[PDB]
Symmetry: C4
Subunit: 249 residues, 4 copies
């Protein structure tokens, strides 16, 4: 049943965003002591609930890039890939809407205090990822592909039962721990936008909620690299597994 | 027998408060370096000990709402729901008393130094949850309903053995990290008062311990929303499971 | 084989102290950002390695109080109890000696800078536990018995295989998590001196390393309550298990 | 085959550096709020991903000393030890290069702002470990030998299936938390340079990247003690197991 699979992908990427976008909205509009580790450990734990909640029906894709890499390297149906990508896009667009509906007055009061009419530099940083001042567009690629490819290589190493002792239940906890490490050690280079649907659907909402063109560009065009560099990174990560380790098991 | 269930619900909600109220009492009266994540991670870990201790004989109903939603969607005995709720109330009222008996002089010295005669503004924040300055009564509902409904939806997804990775033992640990995420990403909006018995029984004690009406109102009528918003949130979260995922298993 | 059991109890309480005493020496003599959670999470993780390392031969007692409670409530040989208590006393006295041998110059330079001739108020706080200014001797009892009794009731609930799904390997990780919660929510009341041998053997060393009478008294006599209140608390915690929950499984 | 083992030791020590060097590079060039625990917890979690990824074909020898001690006490092929060590060196030299390629402009802007021409005093602290101002060369030995010997003694106790609770899958996670404890309780004494290949291959890169002699000496001759003290510590830790516990199983 497909609408069985789609429905979980809507909700499970939601849990990811509300738990991932909630913790950063808490950071900029709620004066919370959130350190780099406190946003990664909560995001990685949140993506683990997304694995736990929606494991049975989908396999917990929650990523347009791990779905495109499971088709090219994991014999997942190509008939399922478009229906999947449109569901965890819509599930993240609605995720941002509810976290802004619950923080509604935290925006108008933080912006009112700091006299931010255009928040496309700090406040929108909550919904989706944005580059640091000290790098540029082609550097985000190298950063997003090299990390999404490392996610794909553990996501295959944890689900690989022909590898070190299989983790019956601890699989989803370490997949979180993994992104915790990628967000803690490289999250400040691009925001660890591992997922094209973790970053674009919130942008199209933030576009709606009064941020405009700058939600896509982010000063210097930035919406391309969250959508294409992860898809170009998860494939590089999937091939290097089946060749460098999978051909060795 | 039933007096087994009640006795554990008394003790198991106790473990929650003393571990949860202890960690925040440490914040205002013991000059501890405690972040939002360190109080959520300690509360969620504490609720996990509450699952572990009193799971085999109770099912770990540490929530007047998780009991009311397991009765409406989990065929729990309706004869057991009132007796269940009175043990987890009395177990939390006694929980606050022991943590106030152990911190007794930390109150009288903190207030004596800061000339706090009426502490229903900061210090009672220890026992139960209180709204932030920037929102109001109808705002707690959206926050408490939308989050208790996210709790109920994992608490069902974690105990769902027809969802792919079965968690033999990691169930109670992942329920903890879940509230760690809800307290870290939305805990400053209402205090994540997910349980009507996590918030009312400590208030009736703080009422006794010299805080007065303001323990119930907290500036504005804040004792209603912990008691009614979780119950209306756990039902929405329980129906949203069996409809959006359960009809998807 | 007994010297088989003793040898592990020497070493496994060592691992506890070096990992537990190391993190606090790092706090006072090495200017490390250690928050209340960073000392509890590292101690609880350290006591978990102590369970992991020395599980097979002893059962990971590491506590003169859990050994005296396993004899009265767990049919452990009374012939083994004295040989056990003298080993994880000596194992903690040597543990403090090596952590002071590695931090040797961090004492003489911190004391040299802060002109501390007598360090029995802050510096010795690293080796063993010491009361806060705002409570007294009879209050430490209530604090140490009520917490050591909560340790004993989880340590029995995690090893109880007739309770919720047994934790094959995750047992030792949650025993740490438990003390993490007791040190995070009540560690500032007495130092969570759960173990009589975690606190006395380091004192007899600190007595040696140039701290004198004040290592035992701590301003106001303090060495009695770490040694007797845990033994009086682990028994209260062991009886309440087999009666309030064990008689219900 | 052997070229399977080498290839994974290249990649698996890479994962360690990029996750370990990334998290501390974030500290000096990215103005991140990073505590001692947040860098140890991220390094130890990263070393756990190194165990998980390359366990089935290597056994996860991510340490020139853990290989040399598994050969002397674990009947590992002596023919495999040199080829093993050259892959985990080259894999760490390339690891630093990719984390310096991703942080490239964060160096030139941090040094340009702080007028750091020679950064072998703070910034190279990113790639490899460096002594603190308050100790000297013979002090690193006691610290590096006593800790690498504690690592080797758990790494054997975790993989010891004749020790009570067998950890099917939790093995790699608990090895991580162990170094989290060693980096949190003794990491400021030497940088917990437990692996000769965690500390030398990044230096030879930092030598290349414009840091010069001072990457090897670090004020005083500090490149020797990461290479020789771990090897002398892992042997003491391996013998202390099979003698104090292994003859106790």
């Amino acid at each position: 049943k497909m609408v069985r699979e789609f429905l979980a992908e809507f909700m499970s990427t939601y849990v990811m965003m509300v738990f991932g976008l909630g913790s950063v909205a808490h950071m900029v509009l709620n004066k919370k002591y959130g350190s780099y580790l406190g946003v990664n450990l909560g995001f990685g734990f949140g993506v683990t609930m997304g694995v736990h909640v929606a494991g049975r029906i989908s396999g917990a894709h929650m990523n347009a890039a791990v779905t495109f890499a499971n088709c090219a390297l994991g014999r997942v149906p190509w008939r399922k890939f478009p229906v999947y990508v449109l569901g965890q896009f819509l599930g993240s667009f609605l995720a941002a809407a509810t976290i802004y509906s619950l923080f509604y007055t935290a925006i108008l009061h933080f912006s009112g205090g700091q006299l931010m009419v255009t928040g496309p530099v700090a406040t929108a940083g909550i919904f989706a990822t944005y580059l640091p001042d000290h790098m540029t567009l082609w550097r985000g690629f190298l950063n997003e592909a090299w990390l999404t490819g490392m996610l794909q290589l553990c996501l295959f190493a944890i689900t690989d039962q022909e590898n070190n002792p299989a983790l019956p239940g601890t699989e989803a906890l370490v997949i979180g721990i993994l992104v915790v490490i990628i967000g803690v050690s490289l999250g400040m280079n691009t925001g660890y936008a591992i997922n094209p649907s973790r970053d674009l659907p919130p942008r199209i909402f933030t576009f709606i909620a009064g941020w405009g063109k700058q939600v896509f560009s982010n000063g210097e065009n930035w919406w391309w690299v969250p959508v294409v560099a992860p898809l170009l990174g998860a494939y590089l990560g999937g091939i290097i597994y089946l060749v460098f380790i999978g051909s060795t098991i």
